[PDB]
Structure formats: structure tokens, C-alpha cells
Design a protein around this ligand. Structure first.
Ligand code: HEM
Ligand SMILES: C[C@@]12C(=O)CC[C@H]1[C@@H]1CCC3=CC(=O)CC[C@]3(C)[C@H]1C=C2c1cccnc1
Length: 454
């Protein structure tokens, strides 16, 4: 490949036949931060098989995301990734069904009835798993991360994949899944980056087989319409049950992979900021009133802005031409992968968000407590001031549910428990760089905390 005058800078690496994969994988955020100050807001690098052109200009997102002339493409590429990662063979129309089923059952009225179930599941797990001693003034010490990610996982899983007559049994099996899930979660980045030793390549195999069996379609009662609907579609289309198993696990990964970790960060920030936790507690003291919790909404967004860091990817279907804010005209070859990293471009942009590495619980609140949606860069409007879900038809179709899960979890935690960090003086764990780009980040080290009934 050779750069043409109208294309953006192409950096092949100092060891040209090794490229930038190694530095990219070690720390993607830092890597992109260094390439930006070297080449500017647009550049091309070869990673894995493909060529990636990173667009780091916040101002160009609106143009790219809304593909006026349909030059870009998400679906085709998405197809390629789930196959290689999960081994799922897409069928004609299954995507359409996912988002069709999501809106019908993960939003509006389907969501209301589902949230009911969540609350029941979320209360059951929290009451039953907290830990007890005959002394009710007895603090219990746990690691905050594993705690939030176990509660959110078990509850979300039972709310979506169903349960049986013996409630306690289900919580037990849900907890067993969680342990295995966490092992797979820990390996996932190095699995996708193909940076694993033989023992781990086999471990990932054992976990995938195990998850296929446990969620097997050849087996409860009362599962979410969301899942019930999809599986049914698959069944009608003639998808073998063995492939249905692989779908169920992919959906498990999507629905439970980020909710827990998000809850962890959101709660940890509240513990590290007395004024923020006061703000939500006072708001919390007044069945289905998620609609009137603006302070908690701001707190969740401010958590997502600080810890959600996915990568927006688009295959260039036919040659794309983008005019930059500055004024250049760049060309993108068909077959190139146009890529956005909203975390660096938008979340940490100090001009869009001043003091960006700081947790400001009221960041998305207006002086009059209203919802704030007016953000600018160099005086210029920004519609995507936070992109923790994606955009277009790649956007997380369960985002409204995920928000219900996280808000509900917080409320119950701050409301009925006394919370304290074991080493409040030690500063917060930073992001594990291994995961940059994979949804919600996970901490570099674990935080101990203690709790008890109020
Ligand atoms: C904090 C919670 C969550 C976060 C941060 C999150 C984040 C994301 C992100 C970043 C994507 C990809 C966006 C893109 O490709 O542009 C995604 C996709 C997806 N998420 Fe989530 N998600 C969450 C919760 C959930 C839940 C609860 C479900 C289901 C119950 C879910 C189902 C999905 C599905 C099905 C997709 C694929 C969308 C598609 O096929 O086009 N997510 N999520
Ligand atoms: C862009 C990315 C990177 O390099 C670091 C961020 C990586 C994505 C993060 C989220 C993700 C979730 C899945 O469920 C399946 C695989 C992907 C899409 C990851 C695949 C990658 C890639 C690497 C070379 C060629 N193609 C894709």
C-alpha cells in the first residue's frame, strides 16, 4: 500500500513488517493519544488484517455517523466479528429481529413489565446474598468490584433468561455462571487480540462449551420476551439448537458484560465524593419513578463518560470523502476501516468538558437542576457529547434497560445500607489499559469496602 496525496497520513511503523499492533494493544488510549499529536486528527495504520483510519476530530462525528450517501457500513463487519469470536453464523434477518425485539421488549411498556421483574430479582439477590451475623450492626467486608458485578449479573441474568420454581437454586446456579463468566471476561481482550498461551486458548474453549451447555436450548419458566422472541425467530428459520446455544451466550455477554462494572464505578465514585452521594440520597427519598430522578441520571452519565470507552467501527463500502473542520479533503479507500474512539475525542476533550478527569456529579445538570444537553467545542455544538452506547444501528438496544438496572441497584444500595471504603485515603483505581476499547472499563486493582443494614 502506498499513500496518495489526498489520503491521510499512513504510518507503517518503524519495524515496517510488524506495524503498530503491539503498541496499540498494550494501551490503545495512550497509543491513539501519541499518534494524534504526531499526525493530527486523522491517520491510517494497519492492525491485524485490515487498514484502520482513525478520525479523532469531535466535529466530524455528526457527518460520519449520519451517512448521508450510504458509503459506510456496520452490519457486514459485525457479522465477521461474532463468527470469529463466538462462532455464531448469522442468518438472513436475525439482526433486524434483534433490534425489532429489543424495542418491543426492552423499551417503553415491555421495559416497564421487565423492570418489575428486575426489581424483584434485584431485591432477592441483595437480601439473600449480603452476608449475615446475628448482630445486625455488623459490617461485612467485600471487594466492591466483585460485589456489584455479582449482584448486577445474577439479577440481570435471572431477569432475562428466566428462572424456575426453586428461587434459591437459581441464585446458586446464577452465581456459578458468574464465576465462570468472570474467568471468560478476564481473558476476553487477550482472546480477541490473540495474545494467549495454549492453556488459555483451551480454557476459553472449555468456558465456551460450558456456557453453550448451561444456556442450552435443550433444557425453566418465565424468560424475558426479548430472549423468547429471538429464539423463536431462530427456531422458525431452522437454526440448529446447537447454534441457538451460541446465540444465548453471545446475548449473555452483551447483556451482563458491562452493567455490573458500570455499577461498580458509579457507586465507587459516590463513596469518594460525599456531596454526590448526599445529592442522590436526598433525591432518593421521594414503584416506578425512575422518570423523576434527574440527579441520578447525571451521575450515571458522568460515570459512563469517565469509564465507558468503546470503539465505533465502520467498513468503508465505497470510497469515502470527508472534509475536516480545519479544511482538508481526505479520501478513504473502500475496504478501509474507519474508526472512532469517542472516549479520547469526546469524553476527555477539556474544551467540551472542562476538567475532564474530574468526577462532577452535577456535570449533566443545569443551574436549575434541569437536564443539560448543550455542549460545544471551539464554540461549536456537539450532539454526541457522550457515546457509551454507540450510534446508528450499532447502538446498544438494551441501554434503557441497562440504565434501569444501574439506577435501581444504586438506589437500593445507598438507601438501605451504610457504605464505607476500607482505605478511603488510597485513590481510586485507574483503568486497566488491556481493555481500552471494549465497552465499560474495569479497575486496575480491586477496592475493599464494608457495609451493613442501616
Ligand atoms: C452499561 C450497560 C451497557 C453498556 C455500557 C453497553 C454498551 C454497548 C456498546 C458500546 C455496544 C456496541 C455499540 C456499537 O457497536 O456502536 C453494545 C451493543 C449491544 N448491547 Fe449493550 N451495553 C449495555 C447493556 C446492555 C444490555 C443490558 C443489553 C441487553 C439486555 C445489551 C445488549 C446489546 C446488544 C444486543 C448489542 C448489539 C447491538 C447490535 O447488534 O447492533 N447491552 N452495548
Ligand atoms: C477494534 C478492536 C481493536 O483493535 C481494539 C478495540 C477492539 C474491538 C472492541 C469491542 C469488540 C467486541 C466483540 O463482541 C468482538 C470484537 C470487537 C469488535 C474488538 C475487535 C477489534 C479488531 C482488531 C483487528 C481487526 N478488526 C477488529
Amino acid at each position: 500500500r502506498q499513500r496518495r496525496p489526498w489520503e491521510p497520513p499512513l504510518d507503517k511503523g518503524t519495524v515496517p513488517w510488524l506495524g503498530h499492533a503491539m503498541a496499540f494493544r498494550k494501551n490503545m488510549f495512550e497509543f491513539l493519544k501519541r499518534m494524534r499529536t504526531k499526525h493530527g486528527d486523522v491517520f491510517t495504520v494497519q492492525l491485524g488484517g485490515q487498514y484502520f483510519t482513525f478520525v479523532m476530530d469531535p466535529l466530524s462525528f455528526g457527518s460520519i455517523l449520519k451517512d448521508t450517501q450510504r458509503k459506510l457500513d456496520f452490519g457486514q463487519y459485525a457479522k465477521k466479528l461474532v463468527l470469529k469470536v463466538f462462532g455464531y453464523r448469522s442468518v438472513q434477518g436475525d439482526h433486524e429481529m434483534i433490534h425489532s425485539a429489543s424495542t418491543k421488549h426492552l423499551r417503553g411498556d415491555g421495559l416497564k413489565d421487565l423492570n418489575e421483574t428486575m426489581l424483584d430479582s434485584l431485591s432477592f439477590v441483595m437480601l439473600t446474598s449480603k452476608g449475615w451475623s446475628l448482630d445486625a450492626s455488623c459490617w461485612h467486608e467485600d471487594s466492591l468490584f466483585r460485589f456489584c458485578y455479582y449482584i448486577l449479573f445474577t439479577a440481570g441474568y435471572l431477569s432475562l433468561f428466566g428462572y424456575t420454581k426453586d428461587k434459591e437454586q437459581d441464585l446458586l446456579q446464577a452465581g456459578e455462571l458468574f464465576m465462570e463468566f468472570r474467568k471468560f471476561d478476564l481473558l476476553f481482550p487477550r482472546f480477541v487480540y490473540s495474545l494467549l498461551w495454549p492453556r488459555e486458548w483451551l480454557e476459553v474453549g472449555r468456558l465456551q462449551r460450558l456456557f453453550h451447555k448451561m444456556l442450552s436450548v435443550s433444557h425453566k419458566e418465565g424468560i424475558s420476551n426479548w430472549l423468547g422472541n429471538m429464539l423463536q425467530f431462530l427456531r422458525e428459520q431452522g437454526v440448529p439448537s446447537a447454534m441457538q446455544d451460541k446465540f444465548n451466550f453471545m446475548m449473555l455477554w452483551a447483556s451482563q458484560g458491562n452493567t455490573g462494572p458500570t455499577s461498580f464505578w458509579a457507586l465507587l465514585y459516590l463513596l469518594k465524593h460525599p456531596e454526590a452521594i448526599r445529592a442522590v440520597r436526598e433525591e432518593a427519598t421521594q414503584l416506578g419513578a425512575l422518570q423523576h430522578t434527574p440527579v441520578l441520571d447525571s451521575v450515571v452519565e458522568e460515570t459512563l463518560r469517565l469509564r465507558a470507552a468503546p470503539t465505533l467501527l465502520r467498513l468503508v463500502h465505497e470510497d469515502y470523502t470527508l472534509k475536516m473542520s480545519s479544511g482538508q479533503e481526505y479520501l478513504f479507500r473502500h475496504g478501509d476501516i474507519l474508526a472512532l474512539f469517542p472516549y479520547l475525542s469526546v469524553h476527555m476533550d477539556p474544551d467540551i468538558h472542562p476538567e475532564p478527569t474530574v468526577f462532577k456529579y452535577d456535570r449533566f445538570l443545569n443551574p436549575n437542576g434541569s437536564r443539560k444537553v448543550d455542549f460545544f467545542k471551539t464554540g461549536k455544538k456537539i450532539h454526541h457529547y457522550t457515546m457509551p452506547w454507540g450510534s446508528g444501528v450499532s447502538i446498544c438496544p438494551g441501554r434503557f434497560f441497562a440504565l434501569s438496572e444501574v439506577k435501581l441497584f444504586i438506589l437500593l444500595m445507598v438507601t438501605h445500607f451504610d457504605l464505607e471504603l476500607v482505605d478511603p485515603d488510597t485513590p481510586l483505581p485507574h483503568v486497566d489499559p488491556q481493555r481500552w476499547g471494549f465497552g465499560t472499563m474495569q479497575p486496575s486493582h480491586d477496592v475493599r469496602f464494608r457495609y451493613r443494614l442501616h
